[PDB]
Amino acid sequence: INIRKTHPLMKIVNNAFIDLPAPSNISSWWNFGSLLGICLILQILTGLFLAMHYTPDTTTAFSSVTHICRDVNYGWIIRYMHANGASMFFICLFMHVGRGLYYGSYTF
Amino acid sequence: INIRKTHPLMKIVNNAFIDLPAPSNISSWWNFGSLLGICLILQILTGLFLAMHYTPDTTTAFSSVTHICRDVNYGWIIRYMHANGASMFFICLFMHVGRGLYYGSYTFLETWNIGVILLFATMATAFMGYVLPWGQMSFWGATVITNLLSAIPYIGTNLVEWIWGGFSVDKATLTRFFAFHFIFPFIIAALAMVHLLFLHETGSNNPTGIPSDTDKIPFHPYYTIKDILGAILLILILMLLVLFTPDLLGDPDNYTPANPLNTPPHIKPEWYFLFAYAILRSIPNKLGGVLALVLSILVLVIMPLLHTSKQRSMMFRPISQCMFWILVADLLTLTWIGGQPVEHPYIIIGQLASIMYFLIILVMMPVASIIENNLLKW
Amino acid sequence: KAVAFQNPQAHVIENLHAAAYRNALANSLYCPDYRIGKVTPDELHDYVQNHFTSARMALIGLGVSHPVLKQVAEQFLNIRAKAKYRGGEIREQNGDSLVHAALVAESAAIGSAEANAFSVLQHVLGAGPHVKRGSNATSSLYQAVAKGVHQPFDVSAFNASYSDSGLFGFYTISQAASAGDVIKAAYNQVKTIAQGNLSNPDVQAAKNKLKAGYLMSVESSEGFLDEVGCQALAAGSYTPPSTVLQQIDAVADADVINAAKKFVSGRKSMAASGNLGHTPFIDEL
Amino acid sequence: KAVAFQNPQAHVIENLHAAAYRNALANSLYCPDYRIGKVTPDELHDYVQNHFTSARMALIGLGVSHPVLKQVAEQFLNIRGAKAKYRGGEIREQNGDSLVHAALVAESAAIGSAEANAFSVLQHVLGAGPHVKRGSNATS
Amino acid sequence: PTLTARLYSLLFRRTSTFALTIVVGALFFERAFDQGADAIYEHINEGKLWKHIKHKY
Amino acid sequence: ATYAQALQSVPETQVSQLDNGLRVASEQSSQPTCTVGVWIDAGSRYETEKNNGAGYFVEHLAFKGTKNRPGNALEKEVESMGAHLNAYSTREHTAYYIKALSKDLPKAVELLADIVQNCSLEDSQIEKERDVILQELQENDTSMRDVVFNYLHATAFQGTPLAQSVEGPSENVRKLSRADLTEYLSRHYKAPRMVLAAAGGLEHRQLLDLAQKHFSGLSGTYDEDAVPTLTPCRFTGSEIRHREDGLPLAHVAIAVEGPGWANPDNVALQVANAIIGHYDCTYGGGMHLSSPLASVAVTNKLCQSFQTFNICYADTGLLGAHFVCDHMSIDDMMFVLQGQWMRLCTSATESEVVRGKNLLRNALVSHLDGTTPVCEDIGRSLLTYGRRIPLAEWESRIAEVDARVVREVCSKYFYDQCPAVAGFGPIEQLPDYNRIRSGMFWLR
Amino acid sequence: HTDIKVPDFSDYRRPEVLDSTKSSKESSEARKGFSYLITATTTVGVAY
Amino acid sequence: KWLEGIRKWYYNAAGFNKLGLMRDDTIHENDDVKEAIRRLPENLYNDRVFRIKRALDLSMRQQILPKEQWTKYEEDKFYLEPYLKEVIRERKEREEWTKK
Ligand code: HEM
Ligand code: HEM
Ligand code: HEM
């Protein structure tokens, strides 16, 4: 019949992402799960590129970060994207905890 | 009723480690799943300590590794655990593959394909880690395999100046390989979970190849103590290797610093990649060599599409059994020829060993299989 | 079996046939409740062996030619129990608040002036109604019980005819606490028709209704196929429908009154199902 | 009901008392097939209120004293159908269990009288349950 | 309203046609949008960029 | 053999017209049984807001006497000639037929004229019919298939009078009087729109002359205002779901855009619904049927039954699929149903089209078997098409339909249209409507 | 169940549909083209 | 012919007469073989699962049967082959009906 209900990975993908019974009156505060997840994959990806251009040595660590920001193509956009994505990550995290405390989700 | 059969974590642990129905027949060759798992988490832990004491730059990498093996407490045993654990990891990986190919467990399709993707991932990870110590052999291994990626026309040279991090093996190459070696085993762990998921979907095998639906025994506490026994045997082999002869497998030519001018005479991999290097230099053609290597591991992809027999195992087929042992001796011959210089008898029998490898797999398995299908009146 | 017996009528007719005969006609078209899953195929093989022989086979072809069918029957078909009457009842407390009651005496076998008299008698007493959503101003039993009881109900005659015996009676669909009045009123009406109080134009209307029923059972080729095959299998000669109508209107109401007397004076049998707190047993009838 | 009618004897005796009376003795010990689930507490209140009266009750004590029972039933109770006709008939069951059970039963007597005592004498003349285990029943 | 009927009938009935449509639109829109934003950023300063003063130098 | 020559010897429909615009239609064959009926274009579509429940009510009052023969003498004489009298009425047409013997024709036609043009109205009769029709409303509530088709028309033709039910609602029936029925009969059962159709053992000059004696003088003098003329009704496309979890099975119907009557797209869609068509849970040979939906539904025990079918109304209709399935297999059944529609519309092979043509030939010949369904076809054909189209023309239109034109027409009508979905029962596992519309077209 | 008619959404309908006397076929093409036009332009921007 | 001598030596040295198995206890199971196993009489099916359970037991202990209980080539009661041929013929007939 359906690959989406018989394949062993796609059973998990179907039961978590498509055929999930969700309530019908979500307001915008129920976005912050996806916002924290997409911030997480963005921070991991930009961080992995930063970790490809970084040298952890206390003589040349700050010079390596300056080398990232000045000399590498768009490395300044990746560095500022990582830092400001961390700040937006904690913004979305405190919105998430505020939702979870205010709407009484702490009975779980 | 019970804690275990209702809780959402312990249902996963119950269908993995406690009440998984496993067959009552599997020999010691079905221990290398758990041995690869324990080697993988041991690599992750000991490598994490090495990465806490390591500075990835082409000026100070070799100096920092020497600082680990002299000045930091027990850095020498943790570094030797990491290197010889890579060696024992590929021993148990090739024994795992040899089991899965000999006992007809390649009739599974999706588990086998995710297996081959795991083989690609572990080989690329171990090569990047072998580049990391920044010795002479690591420098020239990185150079030659990156030019092997440059062998392909219309894609190659731009791709290779792209992953060079410049125009040669510069600082950026060492940092790139540090980052990818330092991330790829987590992807290997996730695909190992996917591998194990498709296995627990289908169900395991046994040395007869007969489906064992009548005689499943639970995993705990029979195979758990069997895998503890296998783990103790593996740790004693690994630890005797790191405490008595740590140099018996490693390269002597690593320990010089990276001079980009010398090019030593006896250039070679670490011993697990000899047959990949032996198929390469036994074909006098660039694209032919790299394509024949990729076609070797794609032949391992091909192997489920040639199961034209009607038993499952090779326990009951003696002709294919003898041909499989010819295949094993031929792969060990390729490893030995790769671990040698290149002269006239070595050239001839390297070419003959690669030819006989492809002839055994792509021709001799179905011919032995069709003599089996003819001979027992089927 | 579940899909077939979701109706009540199948239950009541099968309990009727299971109650009237002590013998081979008591068996049902459908499998019983406990024989499901517990029948070997060897019984099917032995049944096909000692019943599917060429002494018992009528082969009918509509639209096709004769000699092709003859040559096929030559090239392929070369391959070669006095039902006693019991009396009594089957009563089944079911609980749908619609009492179904079938009251049946033994009548006659097929192929007789007596059998045609019973067919005329079921057309006197009323069949499946003609004018749809009508009032049935001609069927005698409905007139008698609508004179009696002011409820929704239905009364229908019932003439099953087989090659050895036959079952004549009627069939009542009534409410819960109204069943006995309907059955007794219908029984009184059948008794006063068996008395002899049946005029001439009612019997002429019954002859016209039987002529209409027989000639309208052969509109479609399904029913015509079944008619030709069953009659050729009965004796071995298809008698045309015009002389069948001749044998229908040959009879007179003396045979009709004799048939009704033979109904009333015989030993009754019944099958009832539903909410049966008021259905009279035998002696109250 | 399932555990009760895994014995054939119960189903034979219930068809027996259904086939020999048109009336109040033809009520089963057990609830039938279709009434399971469709009996409500309204009928429970009705049946309790008009079949549990203070004249239809015998309080019997074994090991207790009479004045204690007199106190109990004097303090704490304080609350306040149709005869069965013979019918005659038969009920058969096609069950295929390779043991034909058959009860042949006629109307004999009401309780209390020497007529019923004479029928008890008659059943012990004819034959009862086996007095000797694994015996031959040569008195029956 | 008729101008969208043939648009639906030619570029949205299929799926592969829809994909080819958005790919060709992506390339054409990339070119036109880069030229437009370059014109906007030149217009918004007109006296400060390296380009015009370097061809004056 | 000689199937073309077998279709040339199919008898011909004699069509003629009386001076009131009456359409008389005799089919003379060689049987001793005849069927005579009146077909009228007067249904539950022409009604007003408060005329709802008029065709049903007049059908239930047409058999209860008249001003010529009182009370029940009509029933008495029809059973005195042994005829079966029947009537029906849908949203589009209304018929009264009589199944009788051949030599009992002219008195039957006289009674038929007294059915049509003299249906008087009695007040005890109108109380009786009000009571009986309320009983029939409450008992047709408990059926399921009629509830599903009424819900389907109600959610498919919103506002437009095609969504008026044939029974009408409860409150437009429990207050009707003689005035509404009087204007109903004065406006709808007119003479230039009714068809006398008679098939069986009767000639044409005989029937024509009897109609000239009796039907001539009926009507044709239509009154001054409100002449009935249709409006092209709007197929909205929506869903209605009656969630009622105290039921064993679930009923789902889904239908798309209307083919109509005159266009040969009707023929192409009947080929497509001969390909998919029907299944019931009580067939033999479950695992091996030709319909792939039947193959999957027996292989995985999805549904009890379905019929994928057509309904055509005047210049509109529904291309439909009704399936009856248990409350744990609704999503999968819906998925395979849309999979079969799109397998027709994307990659239709030749063999299935040939199978559909043969099954539709046998369906048409089996439906035109016996005089009463063939006279039924003649009545509905002289109303809808304006002529009974003969079987040689049906064979030409079938044989001139091949696989390419089938996938063209089916991609015109199935592919990416807005459905009407009616659901009744335990249908919480039915997919939401946007997943249904997303399943109408598959991107691959 | 006969009294189950819709409460109509004549406030919510697009102006090509709103007449209860016109057909609903010829006002379908432009409507689907408009919605799929919006989806196509969004897909172009995201791919860019 | 000597090829029968090859077949007898091969059935001796093949290793599945050692564990008390007959010819059709070692068949690999795709969908067709699963169908042919489901199409069996009851006594042969119970004898089959018993021989299979003894084979898994004897390979668990890695002990091979005494001389007096090896299955012999002269009494080779191969039984699963007719049902398996019928499955293959009906499957190929269905495949050809789909192809044309
Ligand atoms: C595993 C993935 C990650 C890697 C490889 C990574 C790598 C790095 C590296 C190399 C730096 C130093 C570069 C720099 O600061 O200019 C850095 C900085 C930083 N990272 Fe990450 N990071 C990862 C994930 C995260 C996550 C999940 C967060 C939290 C949201 C985070 C928050 C930060 C912050 C706040 C800084 C300091 C930025 C600054 O002030 O310049 N990182 N990361
Ligand atoms: C990344 C390294 C790998 C790990 C950690 C790994 C892990 C495992 C584990 C834990 C099992 C279950 C235990 C067992 O059956 O032995 C397993 C089974 C299996 N693996 Fe892998 N595997 C790896 C690589 C491979 C490769 C390269 C292949 C070959 C393509 C492969 C093929 C199989 C097969 C066929 C089985 C089933 C064996 C059986 O049921 O008897 N695996 N693997
Ligand atoms: C994510 C987990 C891992 C980490 C954190 C890690 C970390 C490191 C570090 C820091 C080094 C440099 C130290 C040295 O060269 O001796 C290294 C080298 C190496 N790693 Fe890994 N590693 C990991 C996984 C693996 C795996 C899975 C393998 C393959 C089995 C592997 C094989 C090697 C090899 C062969 C070397 C070179 C050793 C030498 O020549 O001394 N590593 N790894």
Residue numbers in the entry:
A (entry chain b2): 2 to 109
B (entry chain b1): 2 to 379
C (entry chain a4): 148 to 227, 235 to 439
D (entry chain a2): 148 to 227, 234 to 293
E (entry chain i2): 3 to 59
F (entry chain a3): 2 to 445
G (entry chain f2): 2 to 49
H (entry chain d1): 11 to 110
From the manuscript:
The ETC is composed of four large membrane protein complexes: (1) a H+-pumping NADH-coenzyme Q (CoQ; ubiquinone) oxidoreductase (complex [C]I), (2) a succinate-CoQ oxidoreductase (CII), (3) an obligatorily dimeric H+-pumping CoQH2 (reduced CoQ; ubiquinol)-cytochrome c (cyt c) oxidoreductase (CIII2; cytochrome bc1 complex), and (4) a H+-pumping cyt c oxidase (CIV) responsible for O2 reduction. CI is an ∼1 MDa membrane protein complex with 45 protein subunits arranged into two “arms”: a peripheral arm that extends into the mitochondrial matrix and a membrane arm that is embedded in the IMM (Hirst, 2013, Sazanov, 2015). In mammalian heart mitochondria, the majority of CI is found in association with CIII2 and CIV (SC I+III2+IV; respirasome) or in association with CIII2 alone (SC I+III2). Here, we report the isolation of functional SC I+III2 from ovine heart mitochondria.
Because of the hinge-like motions between the different regions of the SC, we carried out focused refinements on distinct sub-regions to generate higher quality density maps. These focused refinements were performed on the peripheral arm of CI, on the membrane arm of CI and on CIII2, resulting in reconstructions at 3.8–3.9 Å resolution and improved atomic models for each region of the SC. The structures here allowed us to improve the completeness and accuracy of the ovine CI model and to obtain an atomic model of ovine CIII2, with clear density for endogenous CoQ bound to three of the four possible sites. Accordingly, although no exogenous CoQ was added to our cryoEM sample, clear density for the CoQ-10 head group can be seen in the CIII2 focused maps at three of the four CoQ binding sites. Density could be seen at both QN sites, which are expected to have a higher affinity for the oxidized CoQ-10 and the QP site distal from the CI Q-tunnel. However, the QP site proximal to the CI Q-tunnel did not display any density for CoQ-10, suggesting different affinities for CoQ-10 in the QP sites of the different MT-CYB protomers. The two Q cavities of CIII2 penetrate deep into the core of the dimer and are separated from each other by an interaction between the two MT-CYB protomers. Each Q cavity contains a CoQH2-oxidizing QP site and a CoQ-reducing QN site; however, the QP and QN sites within each cavity derive from the opposite CIII protomer and, hence, the QP and QN sites of one MT-CYB subunit face opposite cavities. One of the Q cavities is proximal to the Q-tunnel of CI, while the other is distal on the opposite side of the dimer and much less accessible. The fact that CoQ was found at only three of the four possible binding sites within CIII2 also suggests a functionally relevant effect of CI on CIII2.
